[PDB]
Design a protein around this nucleic acid. Structure first.
Ligand SMILES: NCCCCCCN
Ligand code: NA
Length: 153
RNA sequence: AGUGCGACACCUGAUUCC
DNA sequence: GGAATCAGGTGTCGCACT
């Protein structure tokens, strides 16, 4: 039936050895089977699961704009990313980016970059279970892992 | 802030099986 | 590589008491 106005995308950020001596992080964006915009890229910068998860969503939005898409359904496993961008950020901006314990919000730069990207976009953030066997979740994850094998720069 | 709790991720190691 | 299982870790946030 119907057919809406949204285009669906699955993102994933992975980080092998997260919290260990040599973490390797990547981002993956999946637009559909064999879709030309699918990507698996090495994450530039500080290597962590949280940053990768947030930056995978940035990448999706960025690509979305590249195509004049402005009604996007973005699935991610990261409630940290969802809650951050759809809730915590409003408050952080009104309190000097401060944690529940008054400490500096660690991923400020990441959430700032993400919010800037959301401008002009009607994004519906949805959650997909990390262990979802759905093709979208697996491919995004597989893509992230492939990206993390790349070197930086 | 300290402590505790909650939550979603990301891992590392073993074992079974394909 | 993959279907699971068990141990243990960090990434990071909110919350409530002290
Ligand atoms: N439900 C308790 C989860 C604790 C996660 C600790 C991560 N450093
Ligand atoms: Na994920």
């Amino acid at each position: 039936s119907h057919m809406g106005d949204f285009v669906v995308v699955y993102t994933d950020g992975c980080c092998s050895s997260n919290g260990r001596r040599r973490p390797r992080a990547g981002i993956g964006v999946y637009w559909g089977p064999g879709h030309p915009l699918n990507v698996g890229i090495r994450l530039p910068g500080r290597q962590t699961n949280q940053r990768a998860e947030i930056h995978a969503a940035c990448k999706a939005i960025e690509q979305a704009k590249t195509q004049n898409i402005n009604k996007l359904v973005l699935y991610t496993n990261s409630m940290f990313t969802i809650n951050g961008i759809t809730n915590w950020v409003q408050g952080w901006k009104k309190n000097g980016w401060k944690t529940s314990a008054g400490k500096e919000v660690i991923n400020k730069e990441d959430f700032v970059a993400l919010e800037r990207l959301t401008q002009g976009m009607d994004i519906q953030w949805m959650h997909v279970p990390g262990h979802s066997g759905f093709i979208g979740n697996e491919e995004a994850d597989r893509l992230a892992r492939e990206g993390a094998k790349q070197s930086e720069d």
